[PDB]
């Protein structure tokens, strides 16, 4: 998540003040500049796990084509649950199941 100029709406780029030795975010079409809070200017993940469990919707229990199991919900302890494998579909994706209850909709595994 990156921020934008509050008066120009354009993207703010990181900058360093030579005299102050501080990190700043400065727009390019305007003189607006704001102090940087975090030092993590850039991050790149070679191996990532996002998109595995993020694929959750509140009304996934209304799908009739999804199998229904009897795994115990940690939160609601309901007798009815719906499970599915990982939404991320890379060639080396694990086959672990994600179980969703009909009340709390918490995603969990059998591991």
């Amino acid at each position: 998540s990156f921020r934008f100029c509050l008066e120009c709406n354009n993207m703010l780029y990181p900058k360093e003040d030579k005299e102050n030795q501080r990190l700043l975010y400065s727009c390019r079409n305007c003189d607006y500049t704001e102090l940087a809070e975090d030092p993590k200017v850039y991050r790149h993940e070679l191996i990532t796990n996002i998109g595995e469990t993020a694929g959750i919707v509140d009304d996934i229990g209304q799908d009739p084509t999804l199998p229904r199991s009897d795994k115990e919900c940690p939160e609601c302890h309901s007798r009815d649950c719906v499970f599915f494998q990982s939404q991320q579909r890379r060639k080396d994706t694990n086959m672990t199941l994600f179980y969703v209850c009909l009340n709390c909709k918490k995603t969990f595994r059998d591991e």
Partner: protein
Amino acid sequence: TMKEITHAISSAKEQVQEIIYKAQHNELELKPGMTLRESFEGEVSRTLNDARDSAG
């Protein structure tokens, strides 16, 4: 002979079910040079071919 064939096929289906459970709980050994999915598919195919050969 039909009961023998049915028993063999049922045993093979039970074995495939156990393999499915093991793969779903990360308990499955991985064949070198192949991913988890590829190893799982190869094992299931071998089991089913052996089932047909035994029944025949």
